[PDB]
Design an enzyme around this catalytic site. Structure first.
Site, PDB file in Angstrom:
ATOM      1  N   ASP A   1      -1.592   5.610  -5.591  1.00  0.00           N
ATOM      2  CA  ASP A   1      -2.085   5.027  -4.123  1.00  0.00           C
ATOM      3  C   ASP A   1      -2.461   3.633  -4.123  1.00  0.00           C
ATOM      4  OD1 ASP A   1      -3.242   3.218  -2.239  1.00  0.00           O
ATOM      5  OD2 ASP A   1      -4.312   5.244  -1.467  1.00  0.00           O
TER       6      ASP A   1
ATOM      7  N   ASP B   1       1.051  -0.787  -0.083  1.00  0.00           N
ATOM      8  CA  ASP B   1      -0.159   0.093   0.117  1.00  0.00           C
ATOM      9  C   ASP B   1       0.829   1.338  -0.266  1.00  0.00           C
ATOM     10  OD1 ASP B   1      -2.017   1.812   0.208  1.00  0.00           O
ATOM     11  OD2 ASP B   1      -2.116   1.390   2.370  1.00  0.00           O
TER      12      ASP B   1
END
Ligand SMILES: CC(C)(C)c1cccc(CN[C@H]2CS(=O)(=O)C[C@@H](Cc3cc(F)c(N)c(C[C@H](O)C(F)(F)F)c3)[C@@H]2O)c1
Length: 375
Positions: free
Chosen positions: A218, A35
């Site tokens: 992201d 992430d």
């Protein structure tokens, strides 16, 4: 060796990409979501219906309790846990073991996904957005401080998992030129979009609108997410281009399937999206081009498998522009922390058909000297 790190990711955009890691002594193996959109390393540490396995601290002789708690609310999903440190390794990553902060997740809501095959999350962004605060050193910072591996990593996410390369660029994973955009601020991996076209047509907005109130890369979220104004303009353009087709109620809200007879998806009626990113030289830019093979995300379900079905993977954002997994897919993306820049190149698993292909192209020059940053 980079060759040893290749193909160390599994997963999909919809449920994320994960890498194998170990925690504790002796090592406990877990799959961990990669992430770039957060900065906490956290693992399931208690039983949960959706967890195949979890971190058992009592079985690690190297665990140290920090006796402090931590809570992380994401856009969707949250967890609470206890902070500690322990030994962490990446079996198919760099050949090192480091001591890192670990949030042991003791309670959670809508964080773990049924069937995802990961049990924790590796936040690769900067300390500034770590919880509880910026004093909790993120994993990658610890890795660099303790091993002196070079301060960068790259992600090659592939659709129908990819590679995470730590410490340098694997030229085997991309073709053509690598183009770099500055990291605007080291918190999220924030970047600046200077222009947007949909099928070659400029959206003609003040470029600050494209980055209201930030734009980030992201890997932890599936879709391209756009600020309301930009989102509405994008949907208008895509709807106009595909008008020969009739779409279900709610398709453009991103939660309704559209299907076609196996192999007959009408790719050609959907436009390409070009995101122009700020270049390293003043008022120069480069573009990455996104095909419908990216922003129409295939939903694998044995029940629907007589046909090919998709969801619309562009969403209206309340948090600014998010270049999520479907945008990163097919590109080699270099997070060059040492030089405060992110590079893009066409990767071996880039999307294309016989007429169109994902691309990274530049340089482009822009006359107007406006700063496209929102803050
Ligand atoms: C800095 C921090 C406070 C952490 C914060 C708060 C709000 C947004 C952001 C920006 N990054 C966010 C965007 S998100 O919430 O859509 C996904 C999270 C990480 C995440 C939390 C979750 F639960 C779950 N299931 C997943 C799995 C994804 O849904 C999947 F399946 F990979 F697509 C991922 C990112 O990190 C960061």
């Amino acid at each position: 060796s980079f060759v040893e790190m290749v193909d160390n990711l599994r997963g999909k955009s919809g449920q994320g990409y994960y890498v194998e890691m170990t925690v504790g002594s002796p090592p406990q193996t877990l799959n961990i979501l990669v992430d770039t959109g957060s900065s906490n390393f956290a693992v399931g540490a208690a039983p949960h219906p959706f967890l195949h396995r979890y971190y058992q601290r009592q079985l690690s002789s190297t665990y140290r309790d920090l006796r402090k708690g931590v809570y992380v609310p994401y856009t969707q999903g949250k967890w609470e846990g206890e902070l500690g440190t322990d030994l962490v390794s990446i079996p198919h990553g760099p050949n090192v073991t480091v001591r890192a902060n670990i949030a042991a997740i003791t309670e959670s809501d809508k964080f773990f996904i049924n069937g995802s095959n990961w049990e924790g999350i590796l936040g690769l962004a900067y300390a500034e957005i770590a919880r509880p605060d910026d004093s909790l050193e993120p994993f990658f910072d610890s890795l660099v401080k303790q091993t002196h591996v070079p301060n960068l990593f790259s992600l090659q996410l592939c659709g129908a998992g990819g590679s995470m390369i730590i410490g340098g660029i694997d030229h085997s994973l991309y073709t053509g030129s690598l183009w770099y955009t500055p990291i605007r601020r080291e918190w999220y991996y924030e970047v600046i979009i200077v222009r947007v076209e949909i099928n070659g047509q400029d959206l003609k907005m003040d470029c600050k609108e494209y980055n209201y109130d930030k734009s980030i890369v992201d890997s932890g979220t599936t879709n391209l997410r756009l600020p309301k104004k930009v989102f509405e303009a994008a949907v208008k353009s895509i709807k106009a281009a595909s008008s020969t087709e009739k779409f279900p109620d709610g398709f453009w809200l991103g939660e309704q399937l559209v299907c076609w007879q196996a192999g007959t998806t009408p790719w050609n009626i959907f436009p390409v999206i070009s995101l122009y990113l700020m270049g390293e030289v003043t008022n120069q830019s480069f573009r990455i081009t996104i095909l419908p093979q990216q922003y129409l995300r295939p939903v694998e379900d044995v029940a629907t498998s007589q046909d090919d079905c998709y969801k619309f993977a562009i969403s209206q954002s309340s948090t600014g522009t998010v270049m999520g997994a479907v945008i990163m897919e097919g590109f080699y993306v270099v997070f060059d922390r040492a030089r405060k820049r992110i590079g893009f190149a066409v990767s071996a698993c880039h999307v294309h058909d016989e007429f169109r292909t994902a691309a990274v192209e530049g340089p482009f020059v822009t006359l107007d000297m406006e700063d496209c940053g929102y803050n």
